[PDB]
Amino acid sequence: PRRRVIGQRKILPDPKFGSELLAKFVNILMVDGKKSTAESIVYSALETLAQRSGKSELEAFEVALENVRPTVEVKSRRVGGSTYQVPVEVRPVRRNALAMRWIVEAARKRGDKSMALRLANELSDAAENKGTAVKKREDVHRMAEANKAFA
Amino acid sequence: RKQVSDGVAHIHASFNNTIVTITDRQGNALGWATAGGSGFRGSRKSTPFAAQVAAERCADAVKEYGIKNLEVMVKGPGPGRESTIRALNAAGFRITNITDVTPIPHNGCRPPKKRR
Amino acid sequence: FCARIFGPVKDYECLCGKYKRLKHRGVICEKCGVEVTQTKVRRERMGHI
Amino acid sequence: IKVRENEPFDVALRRFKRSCEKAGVLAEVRRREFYEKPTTERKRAKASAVKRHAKKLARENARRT
RNA sequence: GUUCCCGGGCCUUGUACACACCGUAACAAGGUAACCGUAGGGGAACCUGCGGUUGGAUCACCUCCU
RNA sequence: GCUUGAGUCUCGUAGAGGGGGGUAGAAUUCCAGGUGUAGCGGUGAAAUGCGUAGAGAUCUGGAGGAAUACCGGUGGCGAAGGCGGCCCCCUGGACGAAGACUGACGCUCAGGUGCGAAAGCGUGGGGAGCAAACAGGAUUAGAUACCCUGGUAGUCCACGCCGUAAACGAUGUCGACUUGGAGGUUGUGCCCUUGAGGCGUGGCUUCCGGAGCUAACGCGUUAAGUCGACCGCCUGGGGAGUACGGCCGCAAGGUUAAAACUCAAAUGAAUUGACGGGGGCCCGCACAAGCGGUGGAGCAUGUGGUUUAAUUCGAUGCAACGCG
């Protein structure tokens, strides 16, 4: 607030795979503060989604990430006297954070079975641009073009 | 009709109304367009975007004549005067010359009584 | 061609543009030390790096 | 007033209209005469413009910051 | 990130206020600047036109050239 | 009698200075004709009205009337008011280089006279634009007010009356005296005006200041500073710069210019706060981006209210309601 220029800090990674983004992926899925509980579920989801996708738990996670990753986000930063929105190029520190954010919000959607299978669905579906997680991302994409002109 | 290439387009953005009208080199009027007939009744009559739509109304229903090089002679120092010009350049026209032959008296008659 | 290091281009001159008159002798530009002196003495200005 | 720039332009550039008068003739013939009024705001304006010159004369002597 | 919003604070600007913000006519720019003179009118303050004055306010932003 | 006072002549200069008249050009209104659309005007918004009896708009041609963009400059002339296109006729005021002269012929002044913005009225022409009275649509509790569509006096020219003002850089007029800079504006003398300059001499005017004065602000060679001279004005405000009488006036009024009674103030400059839908900046999860709640459900506690024999009282926007 009014001084913070600082970015993020160091987060304890996942004690299995060498990715802190997957660690960030656990931070958002861990409900009610129970990390270990939701963590072992990331495992039973990442494996099964990667198999329904067709590849490994690293590339089937990447091609399933490129589709749910934001581009822009229009924000209320009016310059003129009119009330409009301004498409904002989203920072790199924020892109994966919002991709993996909507996937878990989509993991609460589709109320089929255990969350390990629900997640296994939404990211495997994300790998093919079908589903409610990617659908969300597509809607924001549609909102960008109608505002991009004020330079 | 009448076959004209050089269309004298008098654009008169007064204060709260902008009229665009292409006429003949001789004087035979071709077609008009106004910020008041295209809609935008209000403080919008004093906006250059309304003048941009005024140029668009003076872009269609005038191709029956078919003007290319037009003498956009602007009158009255008002709101538009550039948004209207580039509306015409993005309409498919080529303005050969933008002239400023605004209604200018040598402080002839007195100005009108309004505004307060 | 620094003014703080070297200085005077005009006879008794503060390069920043504050002291012009030849009344100025030695008084520097406190911001970037320009001792108002002879541009002839600027043929004797040795520096360092 | 009358700008042409042959044909490679794709731009208006009415910069001479403004270098002519534009609002010049308008300032006197848009709202009623009032005769003496403009004169009044001419004095106030000059007082603040000449003081701007006195301002340029006040900054030259120190402004030690 | 401070432009949006709620509260606090510093500097500045203005007041015929400090008893301290039937019609609002003046005093903040009173949100229609004030005042004098001339003619006419209207329940009433005053209003409209014309000439003059400072016993008046801001000259802060949004777009274009080295 | 003599000159540093006033003033005149010889030789020149710039200008919205005044009176009378002529002329050029654009735009607004209207009329006729060619073209063409379904809208024009205006306001915070709306509307009367105009329009299919083809308006608004454009071009060509034409008849009136008022006023002079750009040049424009706290620039210029003038006693002041006041006044911007050009020119012709008459002509005024101000100023300068170098000399010749009468020899203080100088200044102000009650009664008086002349000029006297604008406006009103009588009379002869006149009307594009705007606009008192008035009609209409509304914001509104109402509109004879803001705004708009029409429109008469008037605005313009000439002859008179009223002879009025913030006719106020609020600074009465003539003369003399008093360190400078930036300018603006109009002439001349001297030097290589060789070139957009330098050093002096006068008028008008603006800003910053010294000597000085004052309550302060500030004026400051054009003074609110220092003197001489002349006229007018004030003795608290309101009543009242008005009634009536003299004089003038067709009319509207004006000039000279009071009292009873009443209150214990009236006025001016300068400041700290209160307030701002005035401006800038800084801080806090205020907001932007998210997670979890009350409210929808159950339990526990408390208040208003109700009831009762009694259901103490207190607190009762924030700062009462898991508080005593």
Numbering used by the authors:
A (entry chain J): 1 to 151
B (entry chain N): 12 to 127
C (entry chain 04): 57 to 105
D (entry chain X): 4 to 68
Copy out sentences from the published article reporting this entry, exactly as the authors wrote them.
Maximum likelihood classification reveals conformational rearrangements of RNAP adopting two conformations on the 30S subunit. The two states are related to each other by ~7° rotation around an axis positioned near the Zn-finger motif. The rotation widens the nucleic-acid-binding cleft of RNAP, as the β and β’ subunits move apart by at least 3 Å. Both conformations are intermediate between the open free E. coli RNAP core and the closed holoenzyme (bound with σ-factor) or closed elongating RNAP (i.e., bound with DNA and RNA). Opening of RNAP is implicated in transcriptional elongation and pausing. Consistent with our cross-linking results, the β′- and β-subunits of RNAP form two primary contacts with the 30S subunit. The N-terminal Zn-finger domain of the β′ subunit interacts extensively with ribosomal proteins S2 and S21 and with hairpin-loop 40 (h40) of 16S rRNA. The second binding site between RNAP and 30S is formed by hydrophobic packing of the β-subunit flap helix (β-flap) residues Leu901, Leu902, Ile905, and Phe906 onto S18 residues Phe10, Phe13, Val40, and Ile44. Elongated density connects the β′ subunit of RNAP to the Shine-Dalgarno binding site at the 3′ tail of 16S rRNA. We were able to model oligonucleotide-binding (OB) domains 2 and 3 of S1 into this density, consistent with studies showing that S1 domain 2 interacts with the 30S subunit and with our crosslinking experiments showing that aa 272 of S1 domain 3 is in close proximity to aa 420 of RNAP β-subunit.
